[PDB]
């Protein structure tokens, strides 16, 4: 009836256009209640320390610790040399170096062969 909206990676599907929020099973409602319970216990655990008069300092957050540890120190122990990993490493790490080497070497070879035959107009080029 109308031009349809299709989601993308950087422009996602809205909640009101998502068919999941319109085909609800009892199991879906049970899952939503469980999610609310998990969020609620975490909220209560946070607010108990937050409101505490005695507490002085920073409340330590295990989720933040897990995030930073996973982003730095958990990566190498969970690495396996695979054809995808090997190919991506070789390309992304080696290819730019030889690409730039080729570009710069070509440009400098042209410049030197121009200097050799005395056709560059290097006049007023005192500083280098």
């Amino acid at each position: 009836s109308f031009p349809k909206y299709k989601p993308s990676r950087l422009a996602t599907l809205p909640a009101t256009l998502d068919p999941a929020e319109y085909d609800i099973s009892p199991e879906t409602r049970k899952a939503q209640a469980e999610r609310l319970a998990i969020r609620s216990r975490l909220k209560r655990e946070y607010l108990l320390q937050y409101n505490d008069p005695n507490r002085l300092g920073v409340i330590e957050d295990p989720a933040l610790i897990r995030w930073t540890y996973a982003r730095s120190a958990n990566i190498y122990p969970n690495f396996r040399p695979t054809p995808k990993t090997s190919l991506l490493g070789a390309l992304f790490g080696i290819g730019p170096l030889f690409f730039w080497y080729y570009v710069f070497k070509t440009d400098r070879d042209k410049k030197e062969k121009l200097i050799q035959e005395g056709k560059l107009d290097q006049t007023f080029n005192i500083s280098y």
């Binding site: 256009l17 319970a37 609620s40 005695n54």
Partner: protein
């Protein structure tokens, strides 16, 4: 932002939210008040046309088609209240909100001014200290063994009791702190 959320929104809540959102966007399209009144009455009639539908499959399908209508017909630049999340003054005064615990670190020369304010603050601190264990006890007794199902908090049920977890709600900085 003050009421605890529920596990889900019912059909009635969804259709009401759609009604309010569509009315706001219609007002964005219809700048003038008389034209807005006209088309808002037409919108209300269109909503009332299926007010008492009892086929939940049909009601859900109608709500879904209404959502698809709104998304295509929404104003790309809807009006937003200045202090609302998308507005031009949303978090403008957050740089001026200073937590009250900072007052504990004032030099005694700074506290020499405002003696009455700091005496009242000492009374408030004593009140907060004296009622913490009762609030913790109330929370433990009231809540279920598994844990709290919802983020709703209980009121004070005895006489000399304060509602549990009240200090940070009460001692909010301000909406215009400076």
């Amino acid at each position: 932002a003050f009421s605890a959320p529920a596990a889900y929104l019912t059909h009635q809540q969804k259709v009401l939210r759609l009604y309010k959102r569509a009315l706001r966007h219609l007002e964005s399209w219809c700048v003038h008040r008389d034209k807005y009144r006209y088309f808002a009455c037409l919108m209300r009639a269109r909503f009332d046309e299926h007010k008492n539908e009892k086929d939940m499959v049909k009601a859900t399908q109608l709500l879904r088609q209404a959502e698809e209508e709104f998304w295509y017909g929404q104003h790309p630049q809807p009006y937003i209240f200045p202090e609302s999340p998308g507005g031009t003054s949303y978090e403008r005064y957050e740089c001026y909100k200073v937590p009250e615990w900072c007052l504990d670190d004032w030099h005694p020369s700074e506290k020499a001014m405002y003696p009455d304010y700091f005496a009242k603050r000492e009374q408030w601190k004593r009140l907060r200290r004296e009622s913490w264990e009762r609030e913790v006890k109330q929370l433990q007794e009231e809540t279920p063994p598994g844990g709290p199902r919802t983020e709703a908090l209980p009121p004070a049920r005895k006489e000399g009791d304060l509602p549990p977890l009240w200090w940070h709600i009460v001692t909010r900085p301000r909406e215009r702190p400076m």
